[PDB]
Design a protein around this nucleic acid. Structure first.
Ligand SMILES: [Mg+2]
Ligand SMILES: [Mg+2]
Ligand SMILES: [Mg+2]
Ligand SMILES: [Mg+2]
Ligand SMILES: [Mg+2]
Ligand SMILES: [Mg+2]
Ligand SMILES: [Mg+2]
Ligand SMILES: [Mg+2]
Ligand SMILES: [Mg+2]
Ligand SMILES: [Mg+2]
Ligand SMILES: [Mg+2]
Ligand SMILES: [Mg+2]
Ligand SMILES: [Mg+2]
Ligand SMILES: [Mg+2]
Ligand SMILES: [Mg+2]
Ligand SMILES: [Mg+2]
Ligand SMILES: [Mg+2]
Ligand SMILES: [Mg+2]
Ligand SMILES: [Mg+2]
Ligand SMILES: [Mg+2]
Ligand SMILES: [Mg+2]
Ligand SMILES: [Mg+2]
Ligand SMILES: [Mg+2]
Ligand SMILES: [Zn+2]
Ligand SMILES: [Zn+2]
Lengths: 97, 79, 72, 124, 55, 57
RNA sequence: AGCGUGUGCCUACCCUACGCCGGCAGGCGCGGGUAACCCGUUGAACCCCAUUCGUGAUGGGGAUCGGGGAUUGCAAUUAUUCCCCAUGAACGAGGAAUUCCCAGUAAGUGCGGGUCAUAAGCUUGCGUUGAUUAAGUCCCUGCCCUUUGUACACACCGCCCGU
RNA sequence: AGGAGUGGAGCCUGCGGCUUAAUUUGACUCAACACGGGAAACCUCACCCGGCCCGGACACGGACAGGAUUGACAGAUUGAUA
């Protein structure tokens, strides 16, 4: 799907920071609630997560109206190589606090 | 402002129903039995009853640490 | 019920095909033997379109393609 | 013999503003004008005026087609050829002075009048 | 352009502005007490919500 | 609170209706005391299914 | 009188007291209510007491139409709904046939909820007034048992004979 | 044994027919027919007429910073400022 590169950067940064993603399955929602002040439509998030799922990077669940996505190890490696993050950075999920 | 007691109890019931449905779909493989929500002004605790807790917790507690994330993401109440 | 086809309309509405232009950067500047550079295309007065965003030299108007600003 | 709309002839109607015309109209037209016209109605009016300006001195103006069945016939439209969509075809209507205050959709019928045939077996 | 036309029709009231919160169906909707479910989903989840049949 | 619905997911058969009912009960207690003792007694009061609200008029 | 509803994640859309303007539908202000707290002592309708009419398709009945006004909506025409003048149809108790009902019941009369931006001739509930008849039967209809006959068992919508 | 009735009138609503570009469709004795919680101006919408969009993931091949592709002012065009 066609979208500006900064939207993809923001979505991937949020996904790697948190480790999980939630969406409402609303292609007409003007902007994702979590991605505020960055002007990312919900449709872009849905399609980006679908593209990630097709490659095995994220695991998907659907509940009552919502998409839930969890990050896989190969997805972690792909995001780390994509965002040029140092090997000392891990998502908040992988930290047993 | 605030909502009336009728709406409050109906909303609590709907939240519990949706939470149970999501937990069922997620943890059917782990012998998920039920969910019990104990509401305290400090924190809202959720007890997950299942046959085996090893799969629910995951390795080093990863999987459960994921669930308590998405729940917080879904219903929106603060971290 | 079964879907009927009924496939008959205007023969083919064609999609717009964008023109392929080779080295469109060159025609924006003119060069003298001394080595001077003169900018043939006007520069838009807008904020973002100030230095490298040139306008369009239409036969009766000037048009900036990045902000739809139009001048006579 | 001369046309008058509630005691006002066509020339004065053309001179009047919208506020003056509101008091001549009925309740529905007055409310519609008070709520205001949107962009599409103004575009239709502009096209009709453009078409009427270019007409030859002894010929009728070119037909302007539209889907706007809820457009109110203003006194400035008298003498214009309007094709009104009825869902399938554009029916041609010439605006007469006695149409002031009605809608355009009232003059392009949306169904075919029924001519009945012999009742079938399933009728008792 | 397309951006203006797409989804332009207002949906602030009517059947097109409301749907079930479980299956996204617009028919047989229950709005009392802010349930926002169709009747079938409500019958499926009534016990979980807390509605009991006493009569 | 009462909700009356049709049993059938479709529109076929006898017109039968389900009558679902929910009951809400409410109690009030008044106390002339400082805040600290009220919180002392209230801390134990936590029970599953009961919503307790403390206000100072 | 009684049962109930009332300001809503998305979601825009709540119930209304009081003052003024208008003849009415309505319009302006200014307050309360997230509710045994405000609407609300829910001044409901039938019913009751007086007035007019007087067996006349009549001041019974209110269908169909004309002209105006106002509200909801982005939009009212094929009339959304509401208000005012005017118009004033069949209908004088209903053939063969057929439905429901045994006490606070049948019927009469209003009021809430659902649908609902606009909204009840439907449904689901609630009160108020309040009876005639019956405390039986297998005649009709239908369904159960027992005995009995069967060449039926895809079970009488069966099986089967002869031109 | 009775009461209120329906079947008769006007009208409101569903079901057949007949018309239509379309008059979307399920259900037909009890056990279909103010039933699908179905009181549809738009949406609903599933039917008809006309016009945009991809919201065709992913893999392989081609083409590509000497540019793969994106959007758009004016005039024409269009029901339309698609
Ligand atoms: Mg009379
Ligand atoms: Mg009379
Ligand atoms: Mg009129
Ligand atoms: Mg029609
Ligand atoms: Mg009258
Ligand atoms: Mg009622
Ligand atoms: Mg109502
Ligand atoms: Mg109905
Ligand atoms: Mg008998
Ligand atoms: Mg014998
Ligand atoms: Mg035998
Ligand atoms: Mg009667
Ligand atoms: Mg009768
Ligand atoms: Mg009749
Ligand atoms: Mg029938
Ligand atoms: Mg269909
Ligand atoms: Mg039976
Ligand atoms: Mg129907
Ligand atoms: Mg309607
Ligand atoms: Mg319309
Ligand atoms: Mg439309
Ligand atoms: Mg429609
Ligand atoms: Mg594309
Ligand atoms: Zn510019
Ligand atoms: Zn549903």
């Amino acid at each position: 799907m066609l979208m500006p590169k900064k939207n993809r950067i923001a979505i991937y940064e949020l996904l790697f920071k948190e480790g999980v993603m939630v969406a409402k399955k609303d292609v007409h929602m003007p902007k994702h609630p979590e991605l505020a002040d960055k002007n990312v439509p919900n449709l872009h998030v849905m399609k980006a997560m679908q593209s990630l799922k097709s490659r095995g990077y994220v695991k998907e669940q659907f509940a009552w109206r919502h998409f839930y996505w969890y990050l896989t190890n190969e997805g972690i490696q792909y995001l780390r190589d994509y965002l040029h993050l140092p090997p000392e950075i891990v998502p908040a999920t992988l930290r047993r606090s | 402002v605030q909502i009336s007691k009728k709406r409050k109890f109906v909303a609590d019931g709907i939240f519990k129903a949706e939470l149970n449905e999501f937990l069922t779909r997620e943890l059917a493989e782990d012998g998920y039995s039920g969910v019990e929500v104990r509401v305290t002004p400090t924190r809202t605790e959720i007890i997950i009853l299942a046959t085996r807790t090893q799969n629910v917790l995951g390795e080093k507690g990863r999987r459960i640490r994921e669930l308590t994330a998405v729940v917080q993401k879904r219903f929106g109440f603060p971290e | 019920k079964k879907r009927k086809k009924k496939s008959c309309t205007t023969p083919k509405k064609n999609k717009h095909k964008r023109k392929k232009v080779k080295l469109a950067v060159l025609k924006y500047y003119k060069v003298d033997e001394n080595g001077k550079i003169s900018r043939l295309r006007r520069e838009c007065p807008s904020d973002e379109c100030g230095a490298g965003v040139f306008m369009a030299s239409h036969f009766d108007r000037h048009y900036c393609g990045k902000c739809c600003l139009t001048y006579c | 013999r001369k046309f008058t709309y509630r005691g006002v002839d066509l020339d004065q109607l053309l001179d009047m503003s919208y506020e003056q015309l509101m008091q001549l109209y009925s309740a529905r037209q007055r409310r519609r004008l008070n709520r205001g016209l949107r962009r599409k109605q103004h575009s239709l009016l502009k096209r009709l005026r453009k078409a009427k300006k270019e007409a030859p001195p002894m010929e009728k103006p070119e037909v302007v087609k539209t889907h706007l069945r809820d457009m109110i016939i203003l006194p400035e439209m008298v003498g214009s050829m309007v094709g009104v969509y009825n869902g399938k075809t554009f029916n041609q209507v010439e605006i007469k002075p006695e149409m002031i205050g009605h809608y355009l959709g009232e003059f392009s019928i949306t169904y075919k009048p029924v001519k009945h045939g012999r009742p079938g077996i399933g009728a008792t | 352009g397309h951006q203006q036309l797409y989804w332009s029709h207002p949906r602030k009231f009517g059947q097109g502005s409301r749907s079930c919160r479980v299956c996204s169906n617009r028919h047989g909707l229950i709005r009392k007490y802010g349930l926002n479910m169709c009747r079938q989903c409500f019958r499926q989840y009534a016990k979980d919500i807390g509605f009991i049949k006493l009569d | 609170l009462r909700i009356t619905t049709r049993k059938t997911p479709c529109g076929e058969g006898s017109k039968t209706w389900d009558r679902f009912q929910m009951r809400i009960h409410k109690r009030l207690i008044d106390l002339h005391s400082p805040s600290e003792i009220v919180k002392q007694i209230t801390s134990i009061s936590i029970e599953p299914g009961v919503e307790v609200e403390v206000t100072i008029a």
